Amino acid sequence: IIITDSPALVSGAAETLRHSTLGLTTGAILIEQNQDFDSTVVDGTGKQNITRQY
Amino acid sequence: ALSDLQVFNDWAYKTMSEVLDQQVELFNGATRGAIILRSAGNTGDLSEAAFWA
Amino acid sequence: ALSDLQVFNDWAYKTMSEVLDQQVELFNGATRGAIILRSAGNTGDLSEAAFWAKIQGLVRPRDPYSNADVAAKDLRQLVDNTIKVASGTPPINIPPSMLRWIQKNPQEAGAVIGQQLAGDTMQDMLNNGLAAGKAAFTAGGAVHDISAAGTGLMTQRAFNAAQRIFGDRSTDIQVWVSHSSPLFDLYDNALANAEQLYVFGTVNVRADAFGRPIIITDSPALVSGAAETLRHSTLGLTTGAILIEQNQDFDSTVVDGTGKQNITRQYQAEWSYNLGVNGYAYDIATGGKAPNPTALATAANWDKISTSIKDTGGVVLVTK
Amino acid sequence: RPYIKFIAAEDILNWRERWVNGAKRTTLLVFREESDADDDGYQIYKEEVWRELRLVDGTYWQRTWRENDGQLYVDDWISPTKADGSQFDEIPFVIFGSKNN
Amino acid sequence: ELRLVDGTYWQRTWRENDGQLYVDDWISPTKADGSQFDEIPFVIFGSKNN
Amino acid sequence: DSNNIKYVREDAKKMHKLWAHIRMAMEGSRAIKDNAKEFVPHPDNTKAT
């Protein structure tokens, strides 16, 4: 029994709280990373200080 | 008289940041292959595969 | 001076940028330690040091026959101060498309902004230090005024007044920093000596006749007014009187903002330094956390920390 | 027995370069080690162990991170030693390429 | 500034400080033994000839 | 604590794509035709949809 406080499994509130325990076989959930990771840092002028954005 | 004296307290910068709350290190292998992780590339919004029913 | 018009290795190859017109070589040894330029960073927007005070009633008369009641005494701890000053650079519009002059040089734009910025940065450091020193000395009561007497500037009789003000410890004043007009008035008075204590070979003396050379800079902080109300400020400095301390945190970014028909390429710079005046503390509450030259040069933003004027280093003289 | 591993190009996922006594010394180097779980069945898992090669004050240390049943294991710092002792001064990991090591 | 008077080598140097030409008096360099110099210590080499 | 043993440097992340494409090129025709979507742009996106 593997425990994680994922909001997805909670799906409830107050009295009508409905926790969901789901069992998996091998390869049940498939998640591939498309390795298309963009990370730019843009900096601007015109203000009293140099600004940067991530 | 300590009132006449000058007190500076103390400070430091731990350059440490709390990361997150929930456990997310169960992802691949810990679930015994239930959830896996590859580095495959897909575009559009969808990938298909046909298996003869 | 240099022309270098004869050979053009490259177009406007560092040939001239009229980099600066004011003497700004007044730091460390140049000011005999009076204005020390250092490089040691510190955090926050201040720098506070604490040192013990002089007990005013340390020695008292004693009556052996009747000790009477022992007067209660106590010891304090003064606080030093070193404000942090922030100085930037207005956005500079580099011409991205080379503009097709006789000298076509796109990247020479930034190349020359570097040197012009260095010169103007040192100029700003010196000017802010001088203005802050004047303000602190005026707030401390270390001022003299000879404007109402005669022409308003004597050759050497002026310096004796500052010696009288600073008192018994007058030996430790090394350098007078002043505008060029007081020096030229000095020359004119010496060149026609009423009491002939000058000879043609010794009329060009740059010193103050006491072993304190006059160092000349055209700082705007040392002049104010125009015509009849024009005033020149000459301020003498001991060793370590003015502390300009860089933090070596220079920041510089070039951005391709564009947004118009033609590309827009800009330039920006940022740096900071710590300004301190010996024997005085910048009133952080009265002024600001990141003061500007208007606030730095304004009195009542400086407090006298040392008990005696002899402890603090600097005396200011106003001449018209 | 000593074993000469072969770490795939994508397996080296972290490294660090810090000067001590004015010298190029590598302080941190993390690489992934892949394997297949050994059970009685015939399904093939793919379980990974992460090795953290660290160098502190000129000494080579080592940990392995394991991951099972929703957790992340951490093992004790160890100082591998030579047959003559004296531990190590360099991290026993070399990264090569076309340009240079 | 290299000059040759009566078959003898003399020189002077200038120091310039942002437009402050400080001139030095004419000087007479000599060899190790003496006898000073007979020709200027300067050769202009070109593709054609020196 | 950091607990980021799996963190990858930014430049390594940058090189992952080139490494994967080099692996595909070495792999043969099957890998490229499986992912000819990138290498071969569609002659018309309007038809491509």
Side-chain angles (χ1 to χ4, degrees):
Chain A
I1 297 180
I2 296 164
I3 302 300
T4 182
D5 280 354
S6 66
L9 299 176
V10 178
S11 299
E15 185 267 299
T16 181
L17 186 62
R18 298 291 182 269
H19 298 297
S20 301
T21 299
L22 59 84
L24 303 183
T25 67
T26 183
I29 305 297
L30 183 63
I31 297 169
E32 316 157 27
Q33 322 207 70
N34 290 139
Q35 60 205 355
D36 60 10
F37 179 85
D38 306 342
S39 56
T40 181
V41 188
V42 56
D43 55 357
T45 53
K47 298 293 183 182
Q48 281 279 55
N49 311 288
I50 301 175
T51 185
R52 273 205 210 287
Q53 304 270 89
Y54 193 55
Chain B
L2 193 140
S3 67
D4 291 331
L5 260 60
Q6 183 62 255
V7 285
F8 284 166
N9 309 69
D10 193 359
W11 51 276
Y13 287 78
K14 321 166 54 186
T15 186
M16 181 285 288
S17 66
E18 52 271 21
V19 298
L20 75 164
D21 291 331
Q22 79 160 112
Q23 293 254 330
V24 299
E25 309 285 0
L26 58 87
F27 183 76
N28 188 2
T31 50
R32 288 165 199 212
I35 318 170
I36 62 170
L37 199 45
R38 275 101 62 85
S39 180
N42 297 292
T43 54
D45 59 83
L46 178 143
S47 308
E48 291 150 275
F51 63 91
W52 292 101
Chain C
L2 290 92
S3 182
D4 273 318
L5 174 59
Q6 321 308 128
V7 60
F8 45 103
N9 184 9
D10 301 299
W11 295 272
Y13 70 114
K14 306 173 291 295
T15 180
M16 261 165 78
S17 298
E18 190 276 331
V19 298
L20 197 55
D21 61 7
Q22 180 198 302
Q23 302 308 298
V24 298
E25 305 306 299
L26 280 85
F27 287 117
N28 304 299
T31 39
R32 300 273 298 298
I35 311 181
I36 24 181
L37 179 75
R38 310 201 315 237
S39 49
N42 52 14
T43 62
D45 52 17
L46 272 193
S47 172
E48 266 167 307
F51 56 102
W52 301 100
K54 254 62 161 183
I55 311 166
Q56 69 277 17
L58 191 46
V59 180
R60 71 179 186 90
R62 161 165 71 97
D63 183 8
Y65 293 60
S66 302
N67 201 357
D69 190 285
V70 179
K73 284 162 261 153
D74 189 358
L75 73 165
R76 291 191 309 301
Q77 191 166 1
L78 267 294
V79 62
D80 177 329
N81 198 1
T82 305
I83 188 59
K84 176 177 295 186
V85 180
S87 178
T89 287
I92 313 285
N93 279 356
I94 303 321
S97 169
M98 51 66 78
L99 59 91
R100 278 300 179 126
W101 190 248
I102 320 181
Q103 285 82 4
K104 320 174 194 172
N105 311 296
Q107 55 211 66
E108 209 85 6
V112 299
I113 299 299
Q115 55 187 354
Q116 273 184 221
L117 185 64
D120 291 331
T121 300
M122 311 275 157
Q123 193 194 20
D124 202 27
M125 281 186 228
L126 180 50
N127 284 356
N128 261 313
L130 290 188
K134 183 178 184 293
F137 303 153
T138 312
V143 65
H144 200 70
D145 180 287
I146 62 170
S147 311
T151 75
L153 189 152
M154 325 322 292
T155 180
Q156 324 289 16
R157 322 266 285 289
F159 302 144
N160 308 95
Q163 175 262 311
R164 304 321 191 181
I165 297 169
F166 183 76
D168 291 331
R169 310 258 296 278
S170 309
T171 301
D172 64 2
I173 289 184
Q174 287 69 240
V175 162
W176 309 90
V177 290
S178 158
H179 211 261
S180 73
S181 299
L183 173 65
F184 293 141
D185 279 324
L186 177 70
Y187 283 166
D188 193 76
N189 194 359
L191 207 53
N193 44 4
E195 164 147 14
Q196 53 267 15
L197 78 164
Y198 286 96
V199 183
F200 181 56
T202 70
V203 293
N204 54 2
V205 294
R206 195 91 91 71
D208 78 321
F210 288 84
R212 316 160 182 169
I214 316 287
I215 301 299
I216 301 299
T217 178
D218 284 357
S219 174
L222 299 173
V223 292
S224 57
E228 184 177 1
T229 192
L230 182 63
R231 293 293 195 284
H232 307 277
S233 314
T234 298
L235 60 85
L237 298 175
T238 71
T239 60
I242 302 300
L243 182 62
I244 287 294
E245 167 193 79
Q246 312 170 232
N247 292 13
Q248 284 299 283
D249 58 350
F250 178 81
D251 282 358
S252 182
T253 57
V254 179
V255 60
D256 293 297
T258 316
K260 323 291 165 54
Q261 310 303 301
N262 303 298
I263 316 291
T264 310
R265 213 179 220 184
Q266 297 257 6
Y267 183 78
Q268 188 94 346
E270 293 203 40
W271 61 90
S272 162
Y273 44 80
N274 287 97
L275 188 149
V277 172
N278 195 352
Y280 291 103
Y282 181 72
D283 198 341
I284 178 68
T286 308
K289 309 192 246 214
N292 62 6
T294 303
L296 291 168
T298 294
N301 297 2
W302 299 97
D303 274 9
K304 198 190 153 60
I305 299 295
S306 299
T307 306
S308 196
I309 297 89
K310 296 181 181 184
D311 280 328
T312 190
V315 66
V316 67
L317 174 73
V318 188
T319 61
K320 69 184 290 184
Chain D
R1 187 194 187 280
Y3 293 89
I4 318 298
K5 303 292 180 68
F6 183 34
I7 316 302
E10 284 107 323
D11 268 353
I12 297 97
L13 58 86
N14 202 16
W15 64 89
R16 182 174 283 175
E17 293 192 82
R18 170 47 57 193
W19 292 353
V20 293
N21 290 318
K24 264 312 171 183
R25 314 297 278 175
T26 296
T27 49
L28 169 69
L29 197 149
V30 176
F31 65 99
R32 179 157 41 73
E33 198 160 357
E34 269 280 5
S35 177
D36 283 355
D38 196 63
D39 59 42
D40 204 291
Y42 293 70
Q43 279 71 240
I44 301 173
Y45 292 166
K46 194 194 285 323
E47 50 78 20
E48 307 104 297
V49 54
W50 292 269
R51 320 281 289 282
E52 189 191 4
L53 306 184
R54 191 76 72 91
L55 175 139
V56 306
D57 56 279
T59 294
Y60 157 54
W61 295 80
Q62 182 175 178
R63 286 187 298 178
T64 62
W65 296 65
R66 290 186 186 73
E67 201 255 340
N68 66 82
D69 297 3
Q71 296 294 321
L72 201 43
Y73 282 15
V74 189
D75 310 329
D76 301 286
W77 280 118
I78 63 171
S79 295
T81 60
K82 297 175 261 208
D84 295 331
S86 69
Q87 291 173 350
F88 261 75
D89 284 297
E90 294 180 353
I91 292 181
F93 199 102
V94 63
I95 297 169
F96 50 88
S98 57
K99 285 179 49 59
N100 63 17
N101 296 359
Chain E
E1 171 146 340
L2 312 181
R3 217 167 55 113
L4 186 73
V5 300
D6 64 304
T8 300
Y9 164 48
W10 295 68
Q11 70 177 357
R12 74 188 302 171
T13 71
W14 293 2
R15 175 266 188 294
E16 201 185 90
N17 176 4
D18 286 334
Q20 293 168 55
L21 271 168
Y22 293 10
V23 297
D24 312 328
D25 195 358
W26 284 95
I27 301 299
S28 279
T30 61
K31 312 152 161 165
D33 59 353
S35 74
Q36 184 177 182
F37 263 91
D38 195 350
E39 69 275 16
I40 311 187
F42 201 105
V43 64
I44 286 155
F45 49 91
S47 58
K48 188 178 184 294
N49 48 345
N50 298 358
Chain F
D1 304 2
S2 195
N3 199 3
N4 290 114
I5 181 64
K6 310 176 192 56
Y7 174 73
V8 184
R9 292 170 62 96
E10 196 77 0
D11 60 310
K13 277 186 171 290
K14 274 152 41 73
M15 281 305 218
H16 281 26
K17 220 199 181 175
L18 185 59
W19 289 342
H21 285 347
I22 284 168
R23 298 285 207 188
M24 291 199 193
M26 293 177 70
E27 187 93 1
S29 166
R30 185 177 65 246
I32 299 305
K33 302 200 175 260
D34 186 74
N35 314 277
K37 63 172 221 193
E38 306 102 2
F39 310 123
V40 176
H42 201 292
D44 207 329
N45 54 331
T46 63
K47 288 181 182 177
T49 300

